[PDB]
Amino acid sequence: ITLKVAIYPYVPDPARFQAAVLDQWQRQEPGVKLEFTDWDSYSADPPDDLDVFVLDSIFLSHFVDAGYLLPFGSQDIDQAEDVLPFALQGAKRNGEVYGLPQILCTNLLFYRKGDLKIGQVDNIYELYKKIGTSHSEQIPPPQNKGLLINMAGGTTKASMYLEALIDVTGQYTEYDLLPPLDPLNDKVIRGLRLLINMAGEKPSQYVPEDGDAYVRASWFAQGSGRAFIGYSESMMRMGDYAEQVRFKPISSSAGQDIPLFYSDVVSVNSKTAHPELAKKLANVMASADTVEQALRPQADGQYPQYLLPARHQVYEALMQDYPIYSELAQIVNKPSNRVFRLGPEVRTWLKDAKQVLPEALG
Numbered sequence: 001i002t003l004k005v006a007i008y009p010y011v012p013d014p015a016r017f018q019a020a021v022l023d024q025w026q027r028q029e030p031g032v033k034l035e036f037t038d039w040d041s042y043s044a045d046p047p048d049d050l051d052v053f054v055l056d057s058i059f060l061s062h063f064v065d066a067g068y069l070l071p072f073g074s075q076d077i078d079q080a081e082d083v084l085p086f087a088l089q090g091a092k093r094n095g096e097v098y099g100l101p102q103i104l105c106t107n108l109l110f111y112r113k114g115d116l117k118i119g120q121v122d123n124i125y126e127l128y129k130k131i132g133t134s135h136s137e138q139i140p141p142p143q144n145k146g147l148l149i150n151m152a153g154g155t156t157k158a159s160m161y162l163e164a165l166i167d168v169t170g171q172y173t174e175y176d177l178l179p180p181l182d183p184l185n186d187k188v189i190r191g192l193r194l195l196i197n198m199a200g201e202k203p204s205q206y207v208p209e210d211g212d213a214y215v216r217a218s219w220f221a222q223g224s225g226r227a228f229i230g231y232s233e234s235m236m237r238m239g240d241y242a243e244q245v246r247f248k249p250i251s252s253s254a255g256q257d258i259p260l261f262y263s264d265v266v267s268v269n270s271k272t273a274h275p276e277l278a279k280k281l282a283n284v285m286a287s288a289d290t291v292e293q294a295l296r297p298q299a300d301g302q303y304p305q306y307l308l309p310a311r312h313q314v315y316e317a318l319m320q321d322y323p324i325y326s327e328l329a330q331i332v333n334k335p336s337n338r339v340f341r342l343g344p345e346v347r348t349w350l351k352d353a354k355q356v357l358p359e360a361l362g
C-alpha cells in the first residue's frame with residue numbers, strides 16, 4: 001500500500017513539512033509508503049489518484065458540491081477540542097466537516113521599533129495619514145519611505161476585493177452566491193486604490209522572475225520602506241531582523257472589521273481506495289506534533305517558518321523558545337475571527353473579475 005499525498009506548496013520551507021509528515025507517519029504506519037506529489041488548489045482540481053491533499057478554503061465549496069471530497073464524521077477527527085473553533089466551523093458544508101485545519105493566514109502591519117507613530121495605526125486611512133502617497137516608482141521604495149505590499153496578480157486582487165466587501169457590509173458571508181461584477185462597490189474600490197497610492201504602482205504589481213514570494217520582507221529588513229503589509233510568514237525571511245520589527249492587525253476601514261483568515265485544510269479524495277488509512281494520514285498531517293516540527297528550525301542557520309497553526313497546543317509549545325508566537329497566539333484567538341470562504345462558482349467568477357478589476361483600479 002502506497003498513498004499519494006500533497007502538502008501545501010506555498011510556505012517558506014515545504015521540505016520541512018514533507019520531512020515532518022514522513023517522520024510522524026512512520027511512527028504509526030512504517031509499512032505504508034508515501035509518495036509526495038506537487039499539487040496546487042489555485043490552478044487545478046483534485047486528481048483521481050491523489051489520496052490526501054491540502055487546499056486553500058476559498059475552493060472548499062466548489063470541491064464539496066462537485067463530489068470530490070470524503071466527509072469526516074465526528075469519530076474520524078482526532079482531538080477536535082484543541083482546534084480553534086472558528087477554524088473547525090469554517091471547514092463545514094451541508095452539515096459535515098470536509099477538511100482538517102492545518103495553517104491559517106492574515107496580512108499584518110509591520111513597522112520598525114522606535115517608530116511609535118505607526119504603532120497606533122488601526123486601519124488603512126490612518127496609515128495614509130501617516131505615510132502619505134508614494135512619490136517614486138523605483139523598485140524597491142527608497143530607504144524608510146512608503147508602503148511595501150504585494151498586490152500583484154488577479155486572484156489576489158479579487159480576494160482582497162471580496163474580503164473588503166464583508167467589512168463594508170459588516171455581515172459575514174460564505175458567498176454561496178457571489179456578488180455582481182457590474183455595479184462594483186465604490187467604498188471597496190477606493191480602499192484598494194489607497195493601498196496602491198501608498199505603495200506605488202510598479203512596486204505593488206512587481207513579480208520577481210524567480211518567483212520569490214517573500215522578497216518584500218527582505219527589502220524591509222534591509223531598510224526599504226517605512227511600513228510593510230504582509231503575512232506572518234514574512235518573518236522567516238527577515239531572519240535575525242524578525243526580533244527588531246513590530247506588527248499588529250490592520251483593518252481596511254473604520255467599523256466592525258470582522259477578522260478574516262485564509263485556511264489551508266487537509267482533505268481526502270472521495271475516490272480513494274483506502275478511506276480509513278487516508279483519514280488516519282489526514283489527521284497526522286494536521287496533528288499538533290507534525291505542525292510544530294514543520295515550523296521549528298531543522299538545521300543550522302535556519303529560522304522558524306512563522307506560519308499560523310490552527311491548534312492551541314502548537315502555540316503553547318513554540319512560545320518559550322520563540323516569543324513572537326505569543327503575540328500571534330493572541331491575534332488568532334480573537335472571538336470575532338472568521339474563515340474566508342467563497343462560493344461553488346469561484347473559478348468562473350475569478351475569470352470574470354480579471355476583466356474588470358484592473359481597469360477599475362487604474
Ligand SMILES: *c1nc(C)nc(N)c1C
Pocket residue numbers: 010011103104105106231262
Ligand atoms: C496563506 N495565505 C495565502 C493567501 N497564501 C499562502 N500561501 C498562505 C500560507
